[PDB]
Amino acid sequence: VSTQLLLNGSLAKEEIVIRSENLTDNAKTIIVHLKESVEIVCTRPGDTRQAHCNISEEKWNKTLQKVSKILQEHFPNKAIKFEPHSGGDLEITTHSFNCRGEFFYCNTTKLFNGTYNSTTITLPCRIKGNITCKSIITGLLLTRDGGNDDNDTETFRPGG
Amino acid sequence: YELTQPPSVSVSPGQTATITCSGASTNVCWYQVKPGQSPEVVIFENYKRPSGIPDRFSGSKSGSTATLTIRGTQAIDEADYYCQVWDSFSTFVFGSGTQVTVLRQPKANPTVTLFPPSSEELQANKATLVCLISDFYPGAVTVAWKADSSPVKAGVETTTPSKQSNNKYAASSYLSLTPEQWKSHRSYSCQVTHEGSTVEKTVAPT
Amino acid sequence: QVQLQESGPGVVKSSETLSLTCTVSGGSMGGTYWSWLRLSPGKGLEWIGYIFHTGETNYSPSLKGRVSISVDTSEDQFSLRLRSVTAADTAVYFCASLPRGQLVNAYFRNWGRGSLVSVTAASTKGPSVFPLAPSGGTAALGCLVKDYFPEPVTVSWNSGALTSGVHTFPAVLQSSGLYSLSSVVTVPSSSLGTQTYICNVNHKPSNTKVDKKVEPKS
Ligand SMILES: *[C@@H]1O[C@H](CO)[C@@H](O)[C@H](O)[C@H]1NC(C)=O
Ligand SMILES: *[C@@H]1O[C@H](CO)[C@@H](O)[C@H](O)[C@H]1NC(C)=O
Ligand SMILES: *[C@@H]1O[C@H](CO)[C@@H](O)[C@H](O)[C@H]1NC(C)=O
Ligand SMILES: *[C@@H]1O[C@H](CO)[C@@H](O)[C@H](O)[C@H]1NC(C)=O
Ligand SMILES: *[C@@H]1O[C@H](CO)[C@@H](O)[C@H](O)[C@H]1NC(C)=O
Ligand code: NA
Ligand code: NA
Secondary structure (H helix, E strand, O other), X not given: OOOOEEXXXXXXXXXXXXXXXXXXXXXXXXXXXXXXXXXXXXXXXXXXXXXXXXXXXXXXXXXXXXXXXXXXXXXXXXXEEEXXXXXOOHHHHOEEEEXXXXXXXXXXXXXXXXEOOOOEEXXXXXXXXXXXXXEEEEEEEEEEOOXXXXXXXXXXXOOO | OOEEOOOEEEEOOOOOEEEEEEOOOOOEEEEEEOOOOOOEEEEEOOOEOOOOOOOOEOXXXXXXXXXXXXXXXXXXXXXXXXEEEEOOOOOEEEEOOEEEEEOOOOOEOOEEEEEOOOHHHHHOOOXXXXXXXXXXXXXXXXXXXXXXXXXXXXXXXEOOOEEOOOOOEEEEEEEEEOHHHHHOOOOEEEEEEEOOEEEEEEEOOO | OOEEEEOXXXXXXXXXXXXXXXXXXXXXXXXXXXXXXXXXXXXXXXXXXXXXXXXXXXXXXXXXXXXXXXXXXXXXXXXXXXXXXXXXXOXXXXXXXXXXXXXXXXXXXXXXXXXXXXXXXXXXXOOEEEEEOOOOOEEEXXXXXXEEEOOOOEEEEHHHOEOOOEEEXXXXXXXXXXXXXXXXXXXEHHHOOOOOOEEEEEEXXXXXXXXXXXXXOO
């Protein structure tokens, strides 16, 4: 499947588990399971196709710092940076989902803007009344970029 | 906007040939291009080597500059190489291309000859400077023009090296000006860089 | 087992429109970015743009505006149009593939045949021939065959009598599509002002046969 976030899924009871077929390799999709969910509400007021997605900054801004800490346990003495999707089509680059009879496409660039070291984020979307989906993020789909760049700043991207 | 490669690289048959690629913030891949045929990837993701590619082809990268190393260089390696990188604005950016050449003949310094616009042409209200580079090997040069003492890039046309009967190469570069531009400076100059030496000719209006 | 090849003309006159089509045989158009790229000296290898099977297109910034890529899912072909072309467009065009996904590491697969489209000048024109007067004691003089079309041109010195030292260079392709070249002789410096030197230029396509005497400076 070609998404980025997991809506209405399962939660890792204990803590945060990293699961992949080959962590030493970069081509294989990384699927990190979380414990505490994060609220993501995408409303569609009404351009008319332009929507948004309110997501508390702090919650998200923390559920990447701890996420780095676990990644650092799989990559010794290496920084962990998060950067947006590098895709060529709307379906894969943006957070797409079927919300009450409509497919969305959220420019989720603001979610992955810089390194994380230990208000409300609004994401523009694509496609008359007021629609509202109330899902919760249980996990993340990531994809590491290999190559042994010597800055040792492991860049991660949401994809598959 | 391009990633920066050197125009040429030359080594004796069966030696280490290194090609740089400066200006890439993300991972880099490479393409070998031979005349007529289509480009083909030899290295991807900085140092990954796909099947069909000999294990003498390698490479690495350090933050900014990516590298393509070639040991035991033979005749079947002679080709133009182009590095590529992804981008968040232009999507894809390639390097300026490097020309690998195996020395099968002693090196020769290029003979440069610069001609000023002829009285005849100026009558026609046109002005052309003619830089003629002949008898040099290997076949790869860099032509740089200067007006007075500052560089000039607009109005310059330069051929690609053409092998002559003498086994060596020859090129030419023309700086087209208007008689006004030509006479408003006191000296135009043509500098040709080849290997580790540069010849510079300078003419002036009278 | 996927093959790509580019049909379409190999000649598109100046200020017109270049139209190419890349046929895909042996494989569906789904789950792939069908791209175009071109290659030439003075501009090197540069990406033009690609297209998804839904028609979603992403063109290169540099050529953004006069570029357009379409795709007919039926005939398993995708096209390419490049408007208001010029001499700078003369290059070898390609059609290649890109696996749908992260482009950060992606590299083009299934390269095309290598189609070479040449944007020719507007019509036939004869050359204007100009002399290049001369100043380890030798000296160099030459001729300047300027603004002509099409190829080729033959230059000779002193009715073929003079050969040793002569060197005629490959023509330059002007931005305007026209051609120009130079012939030069390295003659003994003491031969100046005595031994007459003449360049015989002939451009048959325009029945131009100029013989210009190249004599020392005034
Ligand atoms: C995983 O990738 C590594 C290289 O990073 C390789 O050595 C190993 O064999 C791979 N594991 C499997 C199960 O193929
Ligand atoms: C995300 O938002 C930025 C805002 O500048 C926009 O330029 C970019 O194209 C968007 N990405 C996509 C592919 O939606
Ligand atoms: C990048 O981060 C800055 C804050 O450091 C923020 O203002 C900006 O909007 C971010 N850029 C993106 C990709 O949205
Ligand atoms: C959250 O952490 C990120 C780390 O990059 C920082 O850039 C950002 O400014 C922080 N913002 C808030 C509101 O915590
Ligand atoms: C997820 O579940 C919520 C209820 O908690 C529901 O309203 C929403 O439609 C679901 N999300 C999607 C996009 O199906
Ligand atoms: Na070709
Ligand atoms: Na280039």
